[model samples]
Target: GSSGSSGDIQVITQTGVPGQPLNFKAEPESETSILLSWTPPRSDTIANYELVYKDGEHGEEQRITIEPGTSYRLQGLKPNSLYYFRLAARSPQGLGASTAEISARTMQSSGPSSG
Candidate 1:
């Protein structure tokens, strides 16, 4: 048997940490709607996605949770107004890193113009 009296080695590992989503895309669907799409993490599995959005002008926050689907439709928005949003993957462990802030403006209504 050999005797050892040296420094002890420590190993730390993080368990059950979810990975962030990928390829977040916000597309305008209509004057008061926007469609969101993104890909889930390639390696890790997530239970759902937590989406946070706010009116860029007012800064009021709204949150929602959706299945691990790739598409979502955001409706009932003000036309010609900007909205800020972000997404995070969630699992039993916790929420993963959130995506960067995304900004999208609703399209203006099409109407007759003054002569």
Candidate 2:
């Protein structure tokens, strides 16, 4: 015997703050460029990515907006210098939670002569 009528159940995940980038990573690719990589959230409804960073100590905060992707190149940097970066995912709703401020120093120049 089968039920006279059947009902379908619907499910939906919560919205907003699409979660952290997950497995976020920052690697130095060269003396003046760093490669940033990360995975999208479970919902995967990201619109874009925004990277906020500083080149050096007490440096002005800079911003870069990139289309949906897994990695981006942080170009134009000072070698052997420390830099801070914060990445956040964006959605039509708004900005989501961001990764912790990850800091990475560029590789030293081969011909360095100063401290």
Candidate 3:
């Protein structure tokens, strides 16, 4: 739906507008895990976040939803392997623009250590 006055352009309003997340950061926890952190956008129009990621070099794409949070952790990754991540904010209507792609590599495993 839209509304306007004479000679004025009708404005169509939409719900669940899309937006992008902010300050996306990733930390390698170990040879098989990574911790991700991010901030919400500067607008209140966002209701949720979509987190998508994949192995930077190989593997199938993976996706998940975040409900108004700031951080996430991914596990079971290959050691010393690169991975890619993406984040997007979503309103009730739909997903907003996607954030710039982020990348990180899990730390390589260490051999048995002596106490």
Which 10 consecutive residues of model 2 have the lowest summed lDDT?
A: 11-20
**Best candidate according to TM-score:** 2
Q: Predict model 2's lDDT versus the native.
A: 0.82
By summed lDDT, which 10 consecutive residues of candidate 3 come out lowest? 11-20
Taking the tens digit of each residue's C-alpha lDDT, what string does model 1 give over 12-99? 5557666777788787898898998888777456688887888795887788877777778877888888888888888877667788
Ranking by lDDT: 2, 1, 3
Compose the digit string of candidate 3's lDDT tens values, residues 1-115.
5796568777666655655666778889778888878887667665667777876647556877767767776677888788888888767776677878888888877777888
Write down the lDDT of every candidate, Cα atoms only.
Answer: 0.80, 0.82, 0.75
| Model 3: lDDT of residue 12 | 66
lDDT of 2 by residue, 37-66 (tens): 898878666688888897676977887887
For candidate 3, what is the lDDT?
A: 0.75
Clashes of 1: 0
For model 1 the local lDDT of residue 6 reads 82
Cα lDDT, model 2, residue 19: 71
lDDT of 1 at 85: 85
Clashing residue pairs, backbone N/CA/C < 3 A, model 1: none
In model 3, the clashing pairs are 16-93, 18-96, 19-96
